[PDB]
């Protein structure tokens with residue numbers, strides 16, 4: 228029997244996938260998780276006692292982004308091993324393709340939280356390899372179900388690319404992406420490139436956005452905005468065609484913006 232249900236904060240959440248919590252934890256009808264330190268527990272009573280005792284009111288690591296009540300914490304896998312292991316076990320409940328949960332030292336984790344009077348409440352995260360040979364600026368990215376499709380995933384996607392910009396590099400999320408992950412990345416890519424085309428070669432768009440040329444090309448192909456000439460993809464769009472796409476339905480929800488002014492981060 229596997230963990231099939233968790234209590235975290237004020238949410239009960241059904242699992243989507245197997246995650247390798249220890250066997251005696253999976254046998255319980257429900258797993259209880261401290262929303263601040265991510266300690267997982269077998270019983271409501273041990274959960275209630277921990278809450279009265281736990282002094283954490285936010286993730287560990289350093290707050291590298293804060294605007295109003297939106298906050299991002301950078302957490303090194305080597306400095307906060309247990310925390311990051313528990314984060315990975317949590318994420319695996321909602322990610323089919325994640326495979327790494329206990330060797331967290333090669334990773335840095337970026338925790339998105341939403342703050343109120345009580346503390347900084349975890350929304351989701353993405354992990355990133357400290358040294359990515361394949362040029363991946365995201366290893367795994369996960370939004371907890373009650374926060375999905377509400378702008379938090381787009382924020383985190385945009386955030387990963389702001390780091391890539393500061394690193395003077397391009398990057399792409401590690402594949403395979405989840406079903407909702409694909410739609411989210413394609414929508415973010417379209418929004419960003421269409422906005423830049425409204426306000427340029429494919430190499431220019433890549434340097435301005437840190438989106439890889441392949442991801443730019445595949446996105447422009449889905450928008451039918453690229454011509455092919457003698458082995459080279461070429462951007463072929465009229466300023467009116469861009470506006471037609473942009474005012475369409477799906478680009479109407481107001482995003483949580485990444486304000487680079489509020490991002491306190493220096494590249495390694």
Ligand SMILES: CCCOc1cc(C)c(F)c(C(=O)NNS(=O)(=O)c2ccccc2)c1
Pocket residue numbers: 321322368369370371372374375376377378379380381382384405407408410411412414415
């Ligand atoms: C738990 C498994 C998957 O977890 C995720 C992962 C990602 C990358 C997500 F983006 C989301 C998510 O919630 N997307 N919807 S969205 O934020 O409103 C959005 C709107 C427009 C353009 C992009 C995103 C959930």
Ligand code: NA
Pocket residue numbers: 239240241372
């Ligand atoms: Na649920």
Ligand SMILES: [Zn+2]
Pocket residue numbers: 261262263264265266277281282283
């Ligand atoms: Zn705790």
